Amino acid sequence: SEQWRELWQDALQEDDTTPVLAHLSEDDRKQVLTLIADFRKELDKRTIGPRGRQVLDHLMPHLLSDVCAREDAAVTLSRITALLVGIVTRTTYLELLSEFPAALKHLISLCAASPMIASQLARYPLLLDELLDPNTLYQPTATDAYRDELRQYLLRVPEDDEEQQLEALRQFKQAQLLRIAAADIAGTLPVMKVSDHLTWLAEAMIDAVVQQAWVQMVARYGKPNHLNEREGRGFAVVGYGKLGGWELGYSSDLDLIFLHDCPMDAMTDGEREIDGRQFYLRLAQRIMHLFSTRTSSGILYEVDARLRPSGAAGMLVTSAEAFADYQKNEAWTWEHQALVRARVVYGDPQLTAHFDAVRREIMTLPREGKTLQTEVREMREKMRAHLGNKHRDRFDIKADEGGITDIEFITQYLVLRYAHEKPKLTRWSDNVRILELLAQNDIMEEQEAMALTRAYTTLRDELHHLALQELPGHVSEDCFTAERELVRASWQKWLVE
Hints:
There is one protein chain. The chain is mainly α. It is built from 21 helices and seven strands. Helix 4 runs parallel beside helix 7, helix 18 packs across helix 19 and helix 18 packs parallel to helix 21.
């Protein structure tokens, strides 16, 4: 125990011969000693006060004894001191680290396992709350209780206070991401379920953002007056991309478009009367603002709205009737492709019905088979020239031949080709369930649809692991040769012949 105290006290001496570091390699011991020295020098540089220095001197022998005894000492300590350096100014956070040896133990365990978590806890130290209860730290929220949990997390927050409401949503998201990532790392949640949890989480957040925006708008303008005879809001959020496709990762954007079904002559019913439609545009804008603005705990989600009709040049919100017109009369095939993946993530039953029937009608357009196949193949190839890692010796899991986008395009291709003949193909928007549908409806043999499913979930789940390690989305060309061969052969089967 004395020797751990000395490792901290004689830190600057960087004594090579300390027994406590003998288990490590020369280089690793060298790195460990430097890390400790470097940290101690920061204290002198950040000129922290007496209370801080007292807690640190108590806490560091203990902290170093856990970390530095690990085989992975050098990497682990590097992640821990980056975290500490960020919080050495907050006495309370140190005080919490000392008063609770169990929260420290999990901090070290997690940071050793995952630089993603280390970074998050370094960026958002208020998450240290989560480390004080292993029962919740490693059991993430039931997929159907995200809305209830948010509700309960928002109780303390002044409902009149935009900035606190915003900050609270950001806190909630980071807490849930930590729990999700922590359960993955502990094996408490199967990796197969990570995208599922992230997706349920985003939907809860969307629900709460819309709610917050609506209250602000209704307070300024009153309600659009067409909303009689009608329980709900006449506004809809459609999710595209990974959101649509139940494929969210830890640091994903949300691809969203916004619909209304508001008449031209509708007005809001407050004394600050505005046009019904402008009320929704402003609603949409507020929502964007509530997702993207930066508070202490960062931003909530980056929102990408570029897939709306006409892209960046289109209205921020379209009527459902204009969305239908556009899809039938103007949209490119690549837009219809993208639409295979779209689903309503917020809206009332009327507008959901409107979207569903519109999309269903676009899916089941009769399309000339080879013309479509030619279109989808040409588009894939153009994407591949611009997207993903461009190095020959690497395999971009998403972007390269035999990767995820290949599978996605195979599924979108087949729904657009065959939905006219087999309308049940429209029923789900994610790859796993689309492949299932393609088998049930005799487009694809069961062996193939299952082989694409597994290759898909394997590749998608690798990306989750890579995220956890703050590694890029490309791996050695040695990797996943069976998955790629099977996806290439399907590509060749469906898209080239």
